[PDB]
Design a binder for this molecule. Sequence first.
Ligand code: HEC
Length: 156
Amino acid sequence: MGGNPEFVKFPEKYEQIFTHYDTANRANQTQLAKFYANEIAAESYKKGEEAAPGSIVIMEIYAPKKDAEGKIQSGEDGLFVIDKLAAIAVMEKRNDWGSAFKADDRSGNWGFALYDPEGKAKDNDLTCAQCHNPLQKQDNLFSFQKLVDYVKAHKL
Ligand code: HEC
């Protein structure tokens, strides 16, 4: 199982609590993503360019509507039309992860976990940290600039 749900728990009610800072097609061009940040993460990126301990960032991963020939349906706004939520990806930063949590599974101090829409760990063979690791300069977040831009443009 890619990620570490033993350490990175499912953040209950994130969609009602966290700040929704972006919606975008994923770069794979087959899924739609919505991005969320908890208060510590939002305050961190209002102050600087690194998330403080306690920061949690979430990407909801949506399967798009497709016709019977597999063609993805898009709006005139260019965003894929949502069929249903497929997965909930979680990054959580701590400066004191327990020794049982192997460093090679983390991107710096970010732990990863992938959940299904019902909050159960979702089977996968992804190497989360390995793909996020080369983005150290932007705190291992692909959506870094969208988060920075959002919290600069909105009040706490
Ligand atoms: C490259 C092959 C990746 C693998 C392996 C993992 N993720 Fe990642 N992630 C990737 C991209 C390109 C993006 C931006 C959205 C897009 O697809 O265009 C993301 C984003 C996230 C986020 C949102 C925060 C951010 O970095 O922008 C999270 C919370 C996240 N991904 C979690 C995550 C998990 C839990 C993974 C292993 C199960 C994982 N990712 C692997 C690329 C890649």
